Ligand binder design. Structure first.
Ligand code: CLA
Ligand code: CLA
Ligand code: CLA
Ligand code: CLA
Ligand code: CLA
Ligand code: CLA
Ligand code: CLA
Ligand SMILES: CCCCCCCCCCCCCCCCCC(=O)OC[C@H](COP(=O)(O)O)OC(=O)CCCCCCCCCCCCCCCCC
Ligand SMILES: CC1=C[C@H](O)CC(C)(C)[C@H]1/C=C/C(C)=C/C=C/C(C)=C/C=C/C=C(C)/C=C/C=C(C)/C=C/C1=C(C)C[C@H](O)CC1(C)C
Ligand SMILES: CC1=C[C@H](O)CC(C)(C)[C@H]1/C=C/C(C)=C/C=C/C(C)=C/C=C/C=C(C)/C=C/C=C(C)/C=C/C1=C(C)C[C@H](O)CC1(C)C
Ligand SMILES: CC1=C[C@H](O)CC(C)(C)[C@H]1/C=C/C(C)=C/C=C/C(C)=C/C=C/C=C(C)/C=C/C=C(C)/C=C/C1=C(C)C[C@H](O)CC1(C)C
Lengths: 221, 207, 41, 219, 231
């Protein structure tokens, strides 16, 4: 049918990972989303992780490019202490609690959308926050939210194949950015420098600058 | 719709044409409840009339302060009006104000809860009554012709004067001097002297 | 994972995880608030 | 059933229909599953909200008047000791006992009204004053001698609007008094002092800097 | 076939038989797939065209009459006859008025063609985004090809303004000064000449506009758009 995560091989999990979800290639060897409710929850988690990692990786890349350009911009792994030193009037608990509260408001909005896909498009929010559905066949709520506010340019209203192409773009870029953030953390742990620093160090010297030469991955060379 | 083109009147301001200055302006919909709207219309009339009286007093007394007509009574700032000795001290003036305004405002509220029930005095004399907040206190009679236009003029002046007194208190708590002095100091340049160049209004500038 | 979560909901797994989290909570309470002989407010 | 709720997305519990004033469907602990217990909790909410409104008024209006140079009222937390040092001060135990005796007399009558709503209105109770305790059929809303101005007794929905205003104001003042207690317990300053300090530097002056909320042992 | 942004290719879906002027089958990302979004983007394109035309013409004429002044820093060093805060407030008020009127026309056409002052004066019924009447006194021929001329000049002027600000950021001088710098040395004044990245070294032209400029006591972080990503 579709291109699988391991070509050939027809033991791909039973027909809950059929070729319907965006990004579906039959990759669930551990069965972590076997039940349909867990599958929907994990689709929400995957889309959210992809979008969050995409935002985070874009921010990390831009702050690392600005750091190499001489700007007064810290690296991603030390921006918290740099912000606290530059701004001593801010309490750490203050900023943390404010982040918790504001993030919690929108996350409870998303949570009550997960519980009831149609319950967030009324009340204080307008009908644009109803959602458009997609996963598991429903046409309301879910990770994909239409409207003129979360799709203000309207690039998935009209032309359904354009919507499918853009959804595939989003899921592939999100998975790539999740692996990118994993690589960022591993490179910071094994080298102690930024991502762009590692990239230009490897581009300047292709050899003797691989992962085996940092002394952390291979722990004796 | 009148207050904002390409906007729709909030339903309960559409069918009731008999409101002075009904321009459809109720975006927060305070008076959707008809009794709440009646209360807010009475509050309109009261606040507007007291604000017209107050702003006229401020402007006239500050004009007499800037030009010079009255003696030491009129040669004080409006916010420093209590420095004069006058004829009575503070306490008895406030007390008699409480008493007679209790009398008049309870007459007005008794009219409010039952329109036309309180128009007769113990002396036996009687007056005509119309509408609710318009008790026919018209001696020289300008109400016999186009009363809607006169009411519209009154409500426009009332809204202008409520805005005026809000401006008076905001200017006084922002910039020193009389409001006429503030208008003149504005008119001095006027490209620099305005509400941004205060250091007490925008807060983003000048800390 | 319905059967796996049902196994996790079985009485021994739940009681071991519950005594584990309760013991860990008490241990970290004594780690941050040691030698609390009385409830002095 | 379509009224706004405490969580747009979470349906109201089946014991909170919408009739009670201020029913936003908020009962995650399900404390009011019993109807008679629900009525008792409604009366307790009314009493706590009214006493908190009176207390928060008597805290924040004298403190504000002291801030602007009127009357000069001391801090609410130390106002008990300020009076107790007077030359003609009633002793604490005697004053408490007098207050408790009067409140015993009043609120045993209120309690008997809570049980049967037409309790105290029977003839021959007082000395002609029993007519003022008829009640409005709902306990906690007596009327009669109470409510002299007769606000809301005109259209029924006018009284329901005032009931919702009362319950929201009572809840706000209860939260406010809890805030006053917790703010003075942590910081030895008044509520207006805490507010003024927060506007000086909100990122620096808050509950994460008093040293009492977040324990110092963790950090 | 017809005029196309890429000859031999076809139009997409939303652009089949365009009614908007200057339609050449573009939109690779499909931004105008939606209906009302296409009209909103058409209005934003028209006002962008006209504003960038005004900007490029203003920069050019300001340089012809005053070659010694630098347009990028002209907002800070021009010696205003009036104070700037009141001037900015006046602009904010009047432009809020006129842009609110234009935007609500785009929301609904038959809603505000009327003078709020005089009842007799009122714009005639017109297609959205093209007022006319008092706004269009003199028309050299038919309206359609002149609309195409207007929109094409507007695209050219938006590209011109982006080239203007990039010449100002890279060379530190005027775009006609940058022109006369390019003509006498065509092989050397190109960005390919002064900016090459190779896997091992990146050559970036230095920024000329100062990062921080002082203006009436305050400082404005008017650096150079953003560095780092410069080729
Ligand atoms: C936490 C992020 C996240 C989440 C929630 C999901 C969730 C999902 N993925 Mg996805 N995926 C991700 C990241 C994620 N993915 C990344 C980064 C890649 C690129 C490598 C992919 C590539 C991928 C493919 C190709 C496919 C899926 C598919 C699926 C769906 C079915 C699989 C499943 O049910 O297992 C649930 C998954 C989890 C519960 C998260 C696993 C986390 C484990 C428990 C931790 C260990 C993993 C970690 C990498 C080890 C290192 C950790 C630490 C030592 C640093 C499901 C909704 C299949 C699908 O049908 O698409 C709809 C499918 O075809 N994913
Ligand atoms: C949830 C995303 C997230 C992530 C991945 C990080 C990651 C990091 N933060 Mg950070 N932080 C965050 C959110 C996050 N933070 C938020 C919301 C705030 C409040 C605004 C802060 C405030 C903050 C401060 C003040 C500091 C850091 C610091 C750090 C770095 C070292 C911390 C450490 O050694 O312990 C390990 C950290 C983790 C294992 C992260 C896991 C926990 C989250 C929930 C996931 C590290 C790379 C320190 C730094 O600047 O480095 C020198 C520093 O002191 N952060
Ligand atoms: C309803 C508005 C109003 C009110 C409440 C007052 C009130 C007052 N005026 Mg005044 N006045 C007003 C309008 C008003 N005026 C107008 C419109 C004019 C311009 C024609 C004046 C011109 C005026 C003068 C010239 C004087 C007053 C003075 C006074 C004060 C004492 C009057 C007195 O005892 O006789 C007169 C007192 C004498 C010493 C003589 C008194 C508080 C007197 C004053 O200021 O006290 C020193 C004073 O001489 N007024
Ligand atoms: C700058 C502080 C200040 C404030 C807040 C007040 C406030 C007040 N003064 Mg006073 N006064 C002041 C300074 C001040 N004064 C000074 C500096 C002097 C001279 C030295 C005087 C001399 C003076 C005199 C002689 C008299 C007053 C009187 C009054 C009362 C007006 C009567 C009324 O409101 O009707 C009655 C009020 C009600 C029926 C309802 C209570 C009010 C509630 C809250 C509703 C009102 C809404 C509220 C005003 C709007 C919100 C606030 C708004 C400004 C944003 C009023 C409460 C008059 C008075 O005592 O009453 C007759 C009076 O005669 N003042
Ligand atoms: C029923 C008999 C009994 C009682 C009343 C106590 C009482 C106490 N023990 Mg003790 N203990 C006991 C049996 C008992 N123990 C036994 C049988 C052993 C051998 C395993 C120990 C070994 C022991 C050690 C090694 C220590 C104590 C300590 C303490 C004190 C710490 C209080 C605390 O944890 O802070 C308060 C705790 C809370 C506020 C948490 C309450 C809420 C939780 C989360 C709910 C838990 C849900 C279930 C306390 C007075 C500590 C101490 O320092 O002594 C002074 C300590 O070091 N005990
Ligand atoms: C139920 C709410 C409540 C409570 C428990 C209190 C309690 C208190 N108030 Mg307070 N107050 C309240 C509401 C409340 N107030 C409200 C709503 C206001 C108006 C906003 C005020 C305004 C107020 C002021 C201005 C002052 C107090 C003061 C006091 C303290 C001493 C009162 C006293 O001397 O004995 C009781 C008072 C009586 C009059 C007893 C009544 C018996 C008399 C003789 C019969 C009447 C004739 C006391 C702790 C005083 C204080 O702070 O102490 C230094 C003081 O200055 N209150
Ligand atoms: C912000 C200015 C702007 C806006 C709002 C529009 C809007 C529109 N253009 Mg247009 N265009 C512009 C600038 C603009 N254009 C410029 C400067 C050029 C010259 C290169 C062109 C050349 C052009 C052609 C040839 C055609 C259009 C067409 C259209 C219409 C359909 C395309 C569409 O639906 O996507 C809407 C477009 C946007 C919403 C703009 C989004 C801007 C993104 C978010 C920023 C990215 C900038 C990008 C990387 C370039 C950097 C700028 C600079 C370095 C060059 C549409 C109403 C087609 C048409 O049918 O005509 C009516 C068509 O044939 N345009
Ligand atoms: C941690 C393990 C928890 C896995 C979640 C529960 C597995 C459920 C599942 O996979 O469906 C059964 C699934 C059969 O499908 P069913 O119809 O749901 O029973 O079995 C499989 O095909 C895959 C089983 C793999 C289980 C992995 C065990 C751990 C491997 C670690 C290697 C070291
Ligand atoms: C409509 C609406 C609806 C929607 O929905 C929403 C919203 C928006 C909210 C709205 C709006 C509102 C508003 C604006 C309001 C305002 C009001 C006012 C201002 C009042 C005043 C009001 C005001 C007033 C009364 C005033 C008065 C005054 C007076 C008496 C004065 C007096 C005096 C004098 C003479 C002199 C001396 O020496 C001093 C004194 C003593 C000082
Ligand atoms: C709803 C629910 C249900 C679900 O299911 C569950 C849960 C969650 C549990 C819940 C919640 C709850 C809550 C929130 C509670 C709270 C309460 C309060 C706070 C009260 C207070 C309450 C409060 C109160 C009464 C108060 C009162 C006060 C007073 C009188 C005061 C007095 C005073 C004054 C004037 C001043 C002076 O100098 C002092 C004194 C003498 C001190
Ligand atoms: C089409 C499409 C579709 C697809 O699908 C996607 C894509 C591709 C993305 C797209 C797009 C593309 C593009 C190219 C865009 C662009 C635009 C622009 C450039 C705008 C500007 C625009 C521009 C503009 C307005 C400008 C303006 C300017 C101005 C006013 C100036 C002014 C001035 C002057 C006079 C001088 C003085 O001393 C100063 C100043 C103040 C400086």
């Amino acid at each position: 049918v579709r291109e699988l995560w391991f070509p050939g091989n027809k033991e791909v999990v039973p027909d809950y990972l059929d070729g319907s979800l965006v990004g579906d290639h039959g990759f669930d060897p551990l069965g972590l989303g076997s039940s349909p409710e867990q599958l929907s929850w994990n689709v929400h988690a995957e889309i959210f992780h992809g979008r969050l990692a995409m935002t985070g990786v874009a921010g990390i890349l831009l702050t690392s490019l600005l750091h190499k350009g001489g700007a007064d911009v810290p690296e991603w792994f030390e921006a918290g202490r740099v912000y606290l030193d530059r701004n001593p009037n801010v309490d750490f608990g203050a900023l943390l609690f404010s982040t918790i509260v504001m993030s919690g408001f929108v996350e409870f909005k998303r949570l009550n959308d997960i519980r009831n896909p149609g319950s967030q498009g009324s009340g204080i929010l307008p009908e644009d926050f109803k959602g458009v559905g997609g996963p598991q066949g429903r046409t309301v709520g879910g990770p994909y939210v239409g409207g003129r506010y979360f799709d203000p340019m309207g690039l998935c209203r009209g032309s359904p194949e354009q919507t499918l192409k853009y959804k595939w773009n989003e899921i592939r870029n999100g998975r790539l950015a999740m692996m990118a953030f994993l690589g960022f953390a591993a490179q910071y742990a094994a080298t102690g420098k930024g991502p762009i620093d590692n990239l230009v160090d490897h581009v300047a010297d292709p050899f003797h600058t691989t992962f085996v030469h940092n002394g952390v991955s291979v722990p004796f060379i | 719709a009148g207050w904002d083109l390409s906007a729709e009147v909030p339903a309960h301001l559409a069918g009731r044409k008999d409101l002075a200055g009904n321009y459809g302006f109720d975006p927060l919909n305070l008076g959707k409840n008809p009794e709440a709207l009646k209360w807010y219309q009475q509050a309109e009339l009261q606040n507007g009339r007291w604000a017209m009286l107050g702003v006229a007093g401020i402007l006239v007394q500050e004009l007499l302060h800037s030009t010079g007509l009255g003696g030491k009574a009129a040669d004080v700032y409006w916010f420093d009006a209590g420095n004069n000795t006058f004829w009575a001290p503070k306490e008895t003036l406030i007390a008699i104000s409480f008493l007679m305004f209790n009398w008049a405002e309870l007459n007005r509220m008794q009219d409010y809860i039952k329109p036309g029930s309180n128009v007769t005095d113990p002396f036996g004399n009687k007056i005509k009554y119309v509408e609710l907040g318009y008790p026919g206190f018209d001696p020289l009679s300008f109400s016999k012709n186009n009363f809607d236009e006169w009411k519209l003029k009154e409500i426009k002046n009332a809204r202008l004067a409520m805005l005026a007194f809000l401006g008076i208190v905001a200017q006084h708590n922002a910039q020193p001097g009389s409001p006429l002095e503030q208008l003149g100091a504005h008119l001095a340049n006027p490209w620099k002297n305005h509400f941004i160049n205060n250091g007490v209004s925008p807060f983003l500038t000048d800390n | 994972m319905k059967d796996f979560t049902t196994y996790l909901s079985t009485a021994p797994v739940l009681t071991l995880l519950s005594v584990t989290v309760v013991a860990g909570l008490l241990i970290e309470i004594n780690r941050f608030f040691p030698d609390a002989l009385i409830a002095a407010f | 059933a379509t009224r706004p709720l405490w969580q747009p997305g979470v349906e109201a519990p089946k014991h909170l229909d919408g009739t009670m004033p201020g029913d936003f469907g908020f009962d995650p602990l399900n404390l009011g599953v019993n109807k008679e217990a629900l009525n008792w909790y409604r009366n307790a909410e009314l009493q706590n909200g009214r006493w908190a409104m009176l207390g928060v008024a008597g805290i924040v209006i004298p403190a504000e008047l002291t801030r602007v140079g009127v009357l000069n009222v001391p801090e609410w937390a130390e106002a008990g000791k300020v009076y107790a040092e007077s030359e003609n001060a009633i002793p604490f135990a005697s004053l408490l006992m007098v207050q408790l005796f009067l409140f015993n007399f009043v609120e045993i009558k209120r309690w008997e009204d809570i049980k049967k709503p037409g309790s105290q209105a029977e003839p021959g109770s007082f000395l002609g004053f029993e007519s003022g305790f008829k009640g409005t059929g709902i306990s906690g809303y007596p009327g009669g001698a109470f409510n002299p101005f007769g606000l809301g007794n005109s259209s029924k929905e006018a009284m329901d609007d005032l009931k919702w205003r009362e319950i929201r104001n009572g809840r706000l003042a209860m939260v406010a008094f809890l805030g006053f207690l917790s703010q003075h317990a942590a910081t030895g300053k008044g509520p207006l002092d805490n507010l003024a300090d927060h506007l000086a530097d909100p990122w620096g002056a808050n509950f994460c800097s008093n040293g009492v909320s977040i324990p110092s042992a963790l950090g | 076939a017809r005029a196309n942004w890429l000859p031999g290719s076809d139009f997409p879906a939303h652009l089949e038989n365009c009614k908007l002027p200057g339609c050449y089958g573009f939109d690779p990302l499909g931004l105008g797939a939606n209906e009302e979004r296409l009209a909103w983007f058409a209005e934003s394109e028209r006002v962008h065209c006209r504003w960038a035309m005004l900007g490029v013409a203003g920069i050019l004429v300001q340089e012809i009459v005053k070659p010694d002044v630098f347009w990028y820093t002209s907002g800070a060093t021009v010696e205003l006859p009036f104070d700037i805060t009141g001037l900015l407030a006046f602009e904010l008020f009047v432009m809020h008025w006129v842009e609110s009127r234009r935007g609500y026309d785009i929301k609904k056409p038959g809603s505000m063609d009327q003078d709020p002052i005089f009842s007799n004066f009122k714009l005639p019924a017109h297609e959205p985004g093209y007022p006319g009447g008092i706004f269009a006194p003199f028309v050299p021929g038919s309206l359609e090809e002149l609309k195409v001329k207007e929109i094409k000049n507007g695209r050219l002027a938006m590209l011109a303004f982006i080239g203007f600000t990039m010449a100002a950021q890279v060379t530190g001088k005027n775009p006609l000064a940058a022109l006369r710098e390019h003509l006498d040395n065509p092989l050397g004044t190109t960005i390919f000449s002064k900016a090459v990245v190779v896997p091992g070294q990146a050559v970036v032209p230095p920024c000329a506009i100062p990062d921080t400029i002082e203006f009436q006591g305050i400082t404005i972080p008017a650096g150079c758009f953003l560095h780092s990503l410069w080729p």
